[PDB]
């Protein structure tokens, strides 16, 4: 069937005297063939317009400052990860035993190994603080 040959930004029209037609406003077709253009996603409420919607691409969504896009195609706005945890695929998860993040918008990096530098573990570390070393 001819509709296979419709390029992105068009949809296969049933109207005769035309195989395809260009996507209506506020609707996109990122692949060729589609019998219908999909409605452009709105970046409103708790979202913000990163990229605009073209007849060939959806609008890409962005998050407020102090927040980050969480989820497939930014289907969430998670708040920037607090001290003592790192941002993972499945949102904001706490640091593992033996690692720490002592800041906001940070990443869990392992505790200092005091012995490695001929030192001893004066104070142990938490999920939010590093091991304080002492002499051996």
């Amino acid at each position: 069937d001819p509709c296979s040959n419709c390029p992105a930004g068009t949809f296969c029209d049933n109207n005769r005297n035309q195989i395809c037609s260009p996507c209506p406003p506020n609707s996109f077709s990122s692949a060729g063939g589609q019998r219908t253009c999909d409605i452009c996603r709105q970046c409103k409420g708790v979202f913000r317009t990163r990229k605009e919607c073209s007849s060939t691409s959806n609008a890409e969504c962005d998050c407020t400052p102090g927040f980050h896009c969480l989820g497939a195609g930014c289907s969430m706005c998670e708040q920037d990860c607090k001290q003592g945890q790192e941002l993972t695929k499945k949102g904001c998860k706490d640091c593992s035993f033996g690692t720490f993040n002592d800041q906001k918008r940070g990443i869990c990096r392992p505790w200092t190994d005091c012995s490695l530098d001929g030192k001893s573990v004066l104070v142990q570390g938490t999920k939010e603080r590093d091991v304080v070393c002492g002499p051996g």
Partner: antibody, heavy 117, light 109 residues
Framework: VQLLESGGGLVQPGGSLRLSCAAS????????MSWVRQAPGKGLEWVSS????????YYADSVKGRFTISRDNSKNTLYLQMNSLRAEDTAVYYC???????????WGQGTLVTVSS | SDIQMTQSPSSLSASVGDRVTITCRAS??????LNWYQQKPGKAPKLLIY???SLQSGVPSRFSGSGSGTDFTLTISSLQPEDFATYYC??????????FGQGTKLEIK
């Protein structure tokens, strides 16, 4: 966190009401406020929304040019000026808040708007 | 004109202790921009699931949201007495307007 709807009641078609929602226990200023109605027996239909910015007023097709959403972030109050009220408008109206999650987390108890066909 | 949410089934009889599976179908791919609500008669709705999968604070782990694209399912394991209500699925893909499902009523035998 609380949301208290008022101003609903029984009106003749063509008439008007002013709904009010009283917020407390959160930052009203930084909340995307909405009205969602539910006619008796039926489900939930979005009515209107207003951004934290208070410059963006959005409306459902059926209430465009009749209803008007407004907010007074000083008195932490949301309003719905419902004019030219039709029979189809008979419903319980709820004020609903989106804070940081994309889902509506806090709803009010509702206020009943009734039209006498 | 706009995005159509279609829940399946309209009504569902189930006995306590079971696991339930409500469907919600979006008229087009909407990624994971889906919410789940529970409404008990006379009371206002309550947010269960936001972003198709994550739970709101307070909701028990027996309620689990899944799906991406068109087909989404709310699953309630170990049906509990207080879990008998009408459930609604909402989309926030479009904010003007956000659209809800017709609702699925969960009942007893």
């Amino acid at each position: 966190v609380q949301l208290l709807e008022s101003g609903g009641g029984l009106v003749q078609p063509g008439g008007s009401l002013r709904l009010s929602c009283a917020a407390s226990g959160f930052n009203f200023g930084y909340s995307y406020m909405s009205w969602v109605r539910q006619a008796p027996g039926k489900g939930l239909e979005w009515v209107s929304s207003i951004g934290s910015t208070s410059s963006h007023t959005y409306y459902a097709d059926s209430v465009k040019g009749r209803f008007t959403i407004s907010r007074d972030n000083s008195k932490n109050t949301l309003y719905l000026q419902m004019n030219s009220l039709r029979a189809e408008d008979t419903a319980v109206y709820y004020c609903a808040r989106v804070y940081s999650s994309p889902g509506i987390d806090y709803w009010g108890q509702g206020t009943l708007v009734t039209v006498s066909s | 004109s706009d995005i159509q949410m279609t829940q399946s089934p309209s009504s569902l009889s189930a006995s306590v202790g079971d696991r339930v599976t409500i469907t919600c179908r979006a008229s087009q791919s909407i990624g994971s921009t889906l919410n789940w609500y529970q409404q008990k008669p006379g009371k206002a709705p309550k947010l269960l699931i936001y972003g198709a999968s994550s739970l709101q604070s307070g909701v028990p782990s027996r309620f689990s949201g899944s799906g991406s694209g068109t087909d989404f399912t709310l699953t309630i394991s170990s049906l509990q007495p207080e879990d008998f209500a009408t459930y609604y699925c909402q989309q926030y893909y479009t904010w003007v307007p956000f659209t809800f499902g017709q609702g699925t009523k969960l009942e007893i035998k």
